[PDB]
Structure 1
Amino acid sequence: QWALEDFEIGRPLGKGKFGNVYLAREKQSKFILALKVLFKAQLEKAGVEHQLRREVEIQSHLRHPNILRLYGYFHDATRVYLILEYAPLGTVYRELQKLSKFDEQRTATYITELANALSYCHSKRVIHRDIKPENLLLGSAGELKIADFGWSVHAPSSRRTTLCGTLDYLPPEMIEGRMHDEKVDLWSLGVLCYEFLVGKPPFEANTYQETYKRISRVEFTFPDFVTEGARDLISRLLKHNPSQRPMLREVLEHPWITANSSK
């Protein structure tokens, strides 16, 4: 179907791990999209061929406003290309760098859009397992959109034995190896809600063994400006027990969420 020679490459949209992401227009259509370039050599050397496989499959059959679409993909002698949907406003990561902190109104709305998309994924038994400012994109109308389903999985799962990852947004179960479920995304949605209000993750540390400790111990504190409503929602998601964590409906209904969110 598609070939590199079908597209006009634009400017570098962002930097991934197995390759950068670029802007690009379809030659006859003039359709603007993002082309995620991945190097086969690097993918092989890391043995993540199966992860790119799931990412492509899962995301491709996904259909939700708050979820970045994956039209198709194709490839060549050296790299693999993923035809994604273009996110004009960039990432929540950059927006967080710009504003340092987000207000409750902006955070509540960013949480609803995320809880909606996550619900849609969990309804199909799909865990993202990698929800963070870098993989959260903003659409034309500033709406949120979860992307990078590289760690996404159709399941109840165990690890893949490795871990490139800023533990920050990872749940206790994963960080330690156990058999996890969809409740990991609820945990991330807590770290995220805290980072949006404070400006940094709740388990941030200077080392990977210091962060490891705080996440497993669930060691975090709230700054004074963090209202009681936010403190309650965050304290419910960040449970050490996957079972105690609330359901996406208790999140979409939570008093703080319904009193500040616009969506």
Structure 2
Amino acid sequence: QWALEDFEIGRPLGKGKFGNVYLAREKQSKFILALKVLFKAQLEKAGVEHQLRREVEIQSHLRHPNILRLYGYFHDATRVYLILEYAPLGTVYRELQKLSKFDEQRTATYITELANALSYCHSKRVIHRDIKPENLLLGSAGELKIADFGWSVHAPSSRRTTLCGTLDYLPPEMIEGRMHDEKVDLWSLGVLCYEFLVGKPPFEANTYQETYKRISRVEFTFPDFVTEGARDLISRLLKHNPSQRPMLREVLEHPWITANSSKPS
């Protein structure tokens, strides 16, 4: 139903081994949006092909203000095209490299939007498993949207598929191939809260091996400027036992969150 013919392609929003994201405009309506264009070639010659199926099937059926919408898709036997809501203010990744760290009001707000978004996903038993600054996009009023559902599945789940990138955001159950569930995204949330305030993930190391160890041991420390309420929220989320991690309601209602945040639940 859609095809490339319907779009003008603008400036790239991301480039990589498998393809690119483009700013794009639909020709008949002038609707501006993003096109995530993957090379079939590389998805197959990599073993990611099934993930594109789940990314589309899951994201397309989610509707939430803090979830980046997927409007549709098409292909053309060289490439696949994901038709994405365009996020004008970029990534939290870029925001973080810009300001180095975030203040407590801004951190707590981003977390609230995250937990609201995950609340809705966990309602549909959908787990993201790839929550990280590169996949947090900023809407036109600066509000956070979760994007990139390549790693999302329905919970519970195992991991047959290979963990290719950094481990900084993944919980112990996931780096070890165990069965995992919604609590995966809660660990990630605490990683993010920490990174937002400190400027680097709480388990960053020089090697994948060292990083893996620090995650397995839950081995992180706070720089002295991190306050007691943040220390408390982070420590409660970064628990080895997934069952000990809170529910999202306890996060949205954490005192430090409600004090410093501006957005509601």
Scaled to the shorter chain, the TM-score interval is over 0.9
Q: Displacement, 1:16? A: 4.7
Aligned-partner Cα distance in 1 for 2:182–2:26: 36
Q: Displacement, 1:77? A: 2.3
- SS of 2:181's equivalent in the other structure is coil
Q: Displacement, 1:34? A: 0.2
Deviations 1:77-97 (A, max 9, x none): 210010000000000000000
Matched residues, percent identical? 100
Aligned-partner Cα distance in 2 for 1:156–1:162: 17
Deviations 1:34-58 (A, max 9, x none): 0001000000011111100000010
Aligned-partner Cα distance in 1 for 2:11–2:257: 37
Deviations 1:194-227 (A, max 9, x none): 0000000000000000000000011100000000
Aligned to 1:157: 157
Deviations 1:135-192 (A, max 9, x none): 0000000000000000000120000241112100000000011000000000000000
Aligned to 1:122: 122
Deviations 1:25-78 (A, max 9, x none): 001010000000100000001111110000001000000000000000001021
Q: Contact 2:230 / 2:256 at 8 angstroms: preserved in 1?
A: yes
Aligned-partner Cα distance in 2 for 1:239–1:19: 37
- Which shows bigger deviation, 13-22 or 72-81? 13-22
- Which shows bigger deviation, 232-241 or 13-22? 13-22
RMSD over aligned CA atoms reads: 0.7
Q: Displacement, 1:111? A: 0.1
- Which shows bigger deviation, 8-17 or 76-85? 8-17
Q: Gapped runs of 5+ residues in structure 2? A: none
- SS of 2:221's equivalent in the other structure is coil
- SS of 1:159's equivalent in the other structure is coil
- SS of 1:67's equivalent in the other structure is coil
Aligned-partner Cα distance in 2 for 1:153–1:241: 21
Deviations 1:84-116 (A, max 9, x none): 000000000000000000000000000000000
Equivalent residues, number: 263
**How has the CA–CA distance of structure 1 residues 262 and 16 changed in structure 2, closer, same or farther, with 3 Å as cutoff?**
farther
Q: Displacement, 1:17? A: 4.6
- SS of 1:169's equivalent in the other structure is coil
Aligned-partner Cα distance in 1 for 2:66–2:14: 20
Q: Contact 2:127 / 2:182 at 8 angstroms: preserved in 1?
A: yes
Aligned-partner Cα distance in 2 for 1:109–1:28: 37
Q: Contact 2:60 / 2:69 at 8 angstroms: preserved in 1?
A: yes
**How has the CA–CA distance of structure 1 residues 200 and 241 changed in structure 2, closer, same or farther, with 3 Å as cutoff?**
same
Aligned to 2:191: 191
Aligned-partner Cα distance in 1 for 2:17–2:253: 37
- SS of 2:45's equivalent in the other structure is helix
**How has the CA–CA distance of structure 1 residues 161 and 55 changed in structure 2, closer, same or farther, with 3 Å as cutoff?**
closer
Q: Displacement, 1:6? A: 0.8
Aligned-partner Cα distance in 2 for 1:202–1:15: 27
Q: Normalising to structure 1: TM-score of the pair?
A: 0.99
Q: Contact 2:155 / 2:180 at 8 angstroms: preserved in 1?
A: no
Q: Displacement, 1:14? A: 1.7
- SS of 2:231's equivalent in the other structure is helix
Deviations 1:5-34 (A, max 9, x none): 110000001235522100000010100000
Aligned to 1:224: 224
Q: Normalising to structure 2: TM-score of the pair?
A: 0.98
